Each structure stands twice: as C-alpha cells, then as structure tokens.
Design a protein around this nucleic acid. Structure first.
Length: 394
RNA sequence: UGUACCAUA
C-alpha cells in the first residue's frame, strides 16, 4: 500500500486520482475498501476513471482478473460499465470482449479469471457474450477446460446463458468418440456432459423455444446420444460416467434413449452388470424406469436367461441375492413388484393392465426367498427382503 | 452390505 494512504475516512476519488489503484485492488484491506466504495453513488468521472484503470488496459485488466482479490473489483466495474449507457459504452464493452477473447483459455483455466468470464457471459449484451464463446479453443485445450475443476464452470455457464447455435461446436467436439472417452472418464468432464444433456432435453424448461430452435436442439441431442449409446458399455461401468447413463435411463423426457440403452447395452448383460460396482446402479435404474415390455424381458432374463451352474445348480438369482453389489438389484426387483401389487405403482401401461405379470414375478421371488430364508436371514439384504414380503401381506 | 459433482476475499 502507498505510504500516503497508510487510514480510515479515505475517499474513492483520492485512490482514483493517485495512480495507485492497482496497489489497493490486490491488497485484501484495500480491495475491501474499493468494493464498498464502488457500490455507492458514483459520479460520471469516477466511473470514467474506474473504467480506464480497471478494465481499460489489457494488462492491468489481466492482472486483476487473475488476482484473488482483484477479480471481484473487475466484476463490479464490468457491472457498472454495463449499467452506464453513456457514449463510451460501446467501446468499453467491445474492448472488454477483445481482452477476454485474446486470452480465453488462460482465463478459463485460472481459478479467479474464470469467475470474470462467467460474470461477463451472463451480464454482457448477448451479442457480445456470443463472441466470447467463439473465442473458445477447438482442440486439446477444450478438453483441458472441460476437466479442470474451475474452468469446467465456464462451459456450464455458456450452456446456461448462451443460445445453442453459438455453442453447437462444443456438442460436436464432445461427441467426437475420442473426446467423449476422455471427458466422460473425468470427475468434472462428466458434470459438463450432464449439463449439456439437460440443456438439450425437451423438458418443461425448454417450452419457450421456437420450433426452429427445438429442431436445432433435437439434432444436437441425437448427435450426442449417438456417441453416448455407442460407448454405453464403457460409460455405464465407469466410476463417473455411470451417473450420466443413470440420468438418461431415469429421465422420461429421454425415454427413447433409455430404451436404446436398455436394448443394446443392458439386455443380455444383466447378471454380469449387476455384479459391477458402478453399473449395478445403472441396472437398478433400468428396472425402475423400463417400459413394461422391456421390464418383462429384464425380469425374464434374471429368472430364466442363464444356465445354472453345472455342478451346484446355482442360478443367476442365487448368485445375485448374495452378491456384494447384485443383492441391491434383487432388492430393487422385489420392491418394484411389491409396489405394483399394492397400488404404489401403475400397472396399466397405456390402458393395458400388466398386473398379473407383476404377480407372477412376485410369486417367483417370494418362492425363492421362502426356500432360502435361512441363508438369507444371515444378511442385511436378506432380512430386508424377508421384511419387504412380510410388510406386503400386512 | 455398494459410487461422483455442487468450484473464489
């Protein structure tokens, strides 16, 4: 801090006139002062000086943006610039767009500057905000952006506040098989893929779209889903990407994609997937949300899709009930049937009552549980199942 | 008996 300032009762015009702003803005106490001062009434010339000193020169703007304290002052002054419709408005906002553009990647990857980007994206005029998105990298650096724990929030802001036409390139980039593989195998990249999928879903939150815009949305959705269903096996078994497959399977507004995953990824692999740490969650979701015709194939695959062990006679259901992960899938099957038979779940799919299918599955499960009650009572899972059936006839 | 993310003074 400048020696002349080493006080209380200090004015903003002093700091602005002194040439020493940059020293205040990167100091905790100093920046705390500016942040208070900047919220008050500002005269025209005070804004003029803030504009010039904080967002007027590329280098100082970069230095504050990437600064732990400075970035807050940059965001406030950008706010004030946007609120100030004087004659220099245009040059200011245009210049700000140029500054960020020329350093896009560096700023996104920075813990603090990425906050400046986010704030600029949602507050700037949409047409200038759209140019910021154009400045996004189209190569390995985009992947790096998606998987950084700070920078990934830039992509998510873009998705939230920018019309799809401007960021269609991101969808197609992420849908490129190699890219999808790297992004979805990452902690943060998956959140990005998740957010994009949500945005591209024709749900309650997209009813405001024109038809042209819905069409654009649909095409991007198909592109992304084609890549996702092509790697469904890998994504479903992955530690992070299983959440994505679960989201798709559980979302009614994605029903057609849920059926695709079930048919071409899950079906015939149920015993095997039910024993996976990660995919077992996907398999539960599929049972919970499958349309009845597919639900019946799923149930049939468990009850009768596999040949029992040649020596002991153990079947898929024996294996699953006592498996560390598979036991949760059987619990899920049982709970579906009990809900169905007891009114808690709709058995009429499309005016057709599949009630007796659920009764049949329940009867099979109840028969197994009864015969194996002694072994099953040794496990928490087994006790839960026994108890579920008891609570049914009560 | 079984997993993530939710990130600045």
């Amino acid at each position: 801090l400048p020696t002349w300032s080493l006080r209380s009762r200090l004015s903003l015009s002093e700091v602005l006139d002194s040439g020493d702003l940059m020293k205040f803005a990167v100091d905790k106490t100093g920046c705390q002062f500016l942040e208070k001062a900047v919220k008050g009434s500002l005269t025209s010339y005070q804004k003029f000086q803030l504009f010039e000193q904080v967002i007027g020169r590329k280098d100082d703007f970069l230095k504050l943006s990437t600064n732990i304290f400075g970035n807050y002052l940059v965001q406030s002054v950008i706010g004030i610039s946007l609120a100030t419709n004087d004659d220099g408005y245009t040059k200011r906002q245009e210049k700000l767009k140029n500054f960020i553009s020329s350093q896009m990647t560096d700023m996104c990857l920075d813990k603090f500057a990425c906050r400046v980007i986010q704030s600029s994206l949602q507050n700037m005029d949409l047409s200038l905000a759209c140019k910021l998105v154009q400045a996004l990298p189209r190569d390995a650096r985009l992947i790096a952006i998606c998987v950084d724990q700070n920078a990934n929030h830039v992509i998510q802001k873009v998705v939230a506040v920018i019309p799809l036409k401007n960021w269609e390139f991101i969808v197609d980039f992420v849908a490129t098989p190699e890219h999808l593989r790297q992004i979805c195998s990452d902690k943060y990249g998956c959140r990005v893929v998740q957010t994009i999928i949500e945005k591209l879903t024709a749900d309650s939150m997209n009813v405001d779209l024109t038809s042209a815009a819905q069409n654009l949305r649909e095409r991007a959705l198909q592109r992304l889903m084609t890549s996702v269903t092509n790697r469904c096996q890998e994504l479903a078994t992955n530690e992070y990407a299983n959440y994505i497959i679960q989201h798709i399977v559980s979302n009614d507004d994605l029903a057609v994609y849920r059926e695709c995953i079930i048919e071409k990824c899950l079906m015939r692999n149920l015993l095997s997937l039910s024993q996976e740490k990660f995919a077992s969650h996907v398999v539960e979701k599929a049972f919970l949300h499958a349309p009845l015709e597919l639900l019946a194939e799923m149930m049939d695959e468990i009850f009768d899709g596999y040949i029992p062990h040649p020596d002991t006679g153990k079947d898929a259901l024996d294996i699953m009930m006592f498996h560390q992960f598979g036991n949760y899938v059987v619990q899920c099957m049982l709970t579906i049937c009990c809900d169905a038979v007891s009114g808690r779940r709709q058995t009429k799919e499309g005016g057709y009552d599949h009630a007796i299918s659920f009764q049949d599955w329940l009867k099979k499960l109840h028969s197994r549980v009864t015969k194996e009650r002694h072994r099953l009572s040794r496990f928490s899972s087994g006790k839960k199942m026994i108890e579920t059936l008891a609570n049914l006839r009560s």
